[PDB]
Amino acid sequence: IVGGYTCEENSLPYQVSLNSGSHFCGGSLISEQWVVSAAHCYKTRIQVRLGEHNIKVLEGNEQFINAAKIIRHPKYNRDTLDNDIMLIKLSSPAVINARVSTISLPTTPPAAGTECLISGWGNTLSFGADYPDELKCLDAPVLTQAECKASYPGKITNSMFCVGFLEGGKDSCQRDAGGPVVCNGQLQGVVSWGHGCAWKNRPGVYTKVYNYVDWIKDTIAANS
Ligand SMILES: [Ca+2]
């Protein structure tokens, strides 16, 4: 996250870190046993780290749980990032407390102009790189679809929306992928195209979670 702020510790209790040795992607806890992330974050083995603030320091509220099932959307396209969404089933249920809690699925798509919260441990610089120890946050509005399409002509599919500032300065960046975009208490997005890194006319592109609610439900049911 570029141009954001350090979140209050454990104030985003749905935010998880995906780990394969080290942190490499974000995700969101949507039920005691399931996490939503980006399909491009797939690895054949993933440890989900919940309750984190500083990912380098065991602070005492963490839960480390291995992924038991890692399911990409079946229409995921690695090249275009169409349908860039994935579900992780945890090996044991998360323990719900002040520091580990779920985020509601959305009941409607988000309107342009809605204020959202994007978070993660990705690069915090537009020039060079700094990967933070503590979770970063960014408040940003949903952009109109025309602004999104004009930023990336021919590349914005029906599964995508943009959040940010066409002027640059505040955005997601490398290793925020997979993480949450939360608007009015609901998970509306998954960080998908997180290479814009706050450059002008290159806002972040996010997967429209609302378009996948039925797939999410069906997948949970099929693997429960
Ligand atoms: Ca920690």
Ligand 1 centre distance from Cα of residue 7 (Å): 14
CA angle 146, 150, 155 (to 5 degrees): 100
Task: Tell me, in angstroms, the distance from the centre of ligand 1 to residue 43's CA.
Answer: 22
Q: What is the resolution of this structure in A?
A: 1.6
The span from the CA of 47 to the CA of 77, in Å, is 24
Distance CA 201, CA 43 (A): 31
Residue 23 C-alpha to ligand 1 middle, in angstroms? 11
Which H helix or E strand runs over 48? Answer: strand 47-50
Give residue 222 CA to ligand 1 midpoint distance, Å.
Answer: 33
CA of 58 to the centre of ligand 1 (A): 4
Give the domains, in start order, of the chain with CATH numbers.
15-102+212-222 (2.40.10.10), 103-210 (2.40.10.10)
13 CA distance to ligand 1 middle (Å) = 13
Distance in Å, CA 75 to ligand 1 centroid: 35
Dihedral, 68, 73, 78, 79 alpha carbons, nearest 10: -170
**Count of other CB atoms within 10 angstroms of residue 198:** 25
CA of 175 to the centre of ligand 1 (A): 17
Q: State in Å: Cα 207 to ligand 1 middle.
A: 28
* Nearest C-alpha neighbor of 73 from the set 224, 207, 221, 204: 207
What residues contact 41, with CB distance under 8 A and at least 6 apart? Answer: 18, 24, 25, 27, 86, 177, 178
Torsion angle defined by CA atoms of residues 177, 155, 188 and 8, in that order, rounded to the nearest 10 degrees: 40
* Ligand 1 centroid distance, CA of 142 (Å): 31
Cβ(121)–Cβ(18) below 8 Å: no
Rounded distance from Cα 147 to ligand 1 centre (Å):
38
Alpha carbons 48 and 27: distance in angstroms, whole number: 9
CB atoms inside a 10 Å sphere around CB 18: 27
Report the separation in Å between the CA atom of 217 and the middle of ligand 1, taken as the mean of its atom positions. Answer: 31
- Cα gap 167→31, rounded to integer Å: 36
